[PDB]
Amino acid sequence: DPMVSKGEELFTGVVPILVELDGDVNGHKFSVSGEGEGDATYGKLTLKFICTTGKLPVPWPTLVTTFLMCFARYPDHMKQHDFFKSAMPEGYVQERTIFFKDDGNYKTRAEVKFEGDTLVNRIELKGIDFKEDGNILGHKLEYNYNSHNVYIMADKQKNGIKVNFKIRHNIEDGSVQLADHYQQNTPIGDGPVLLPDNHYLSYQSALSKDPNEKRDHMVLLEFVTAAGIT
């Protein structure tokens, strides 16, 4: 399929990634930069993020979803369902509202696209109605992350997709903080895209710290595999 070929050819090896985030949660301003690489053949991404404005005013885990679905490993039998690659290199817009149960909400807008050989994810995040002493502004979330399926459907009237999913962040008392994600992606370009049948992406995320790093940061290792169209 010369279409599957175009996106294929962009992701076949190891692709450098750059991430930039401008954040404001309850007027706590911040900026994050990330660098790493993805190898979609293996569904694999390796990233390191730095708060370049000093202390991050929210827990790092809360940002993981916001900080690259074009790097999902879509099995051969499913390559006709990979919207994300199909929009490249022009890219796509990924918008979310993330509702933290009994707390605030993030609203994010990202543009994911190639700048030359580099895959770039430029994000703006606005957080409002947070409790200054809740789980998020009070930094009560554990530095870890659970595995999760993410459900993708077509949004044919918007030439895009809709993604809907829940993340449960572990709180240090042993309870969980639900973060209910609503998501929409739409291609940046005017060209054809692959609009998928319902399927899901399976995510595993491991968070760690660079022992030589003094700044406030997060090392993220993610594996993402499409499924659910057997």
What is 34-99 written as a DSSP string? EEEEEEGGGTEEEEEEEETTSS-SS-GGGGTTT--GGG-B--GGGGGG-HHHHTTTT-EEEEEEEE
Angle at 44 between CA 42 and CA 47, to 5 degrees: 160
**CATH superfamily membership of 1-230:** Green fluorescent protein (2.40.155.10)
Q: How many CA atoms, within 13 angstroms, populate the side-chain half-sphere of residue 51? A: 19
Method: X-ray
Entry resolution (Å): 1.4
What is the chain written as a DSSP string? -HHHHHHHHHHSS-EEEEEEEEEEETTEEEEEEEEEEEEGGGTEEEEEEEETTSS-SS-GGGGTTT--GGG-B--GGGGGG-HHHHTTTT-EEEEEEEEETTS-EEEEEEEEEEETTEEEEEEEEEEES--TTSTTTTT-B-S----EEEEEEEEGGGTEEEEEEEEEEEBTTS-EEEEEEEEEEEESSSS--PPPPSEEEEEEEEEE--TT--SSEEEEEEEEEEES--
Instruction: Measure the CA–CA gap between 78 and 150, rounded to whole angstroms.
Output: 16
Residue with tokens 């009994």: 102
The domain limits of the chain are 1-230
Burial of 142 (0-12, 13-18, 19+ CB in 10 A): middle
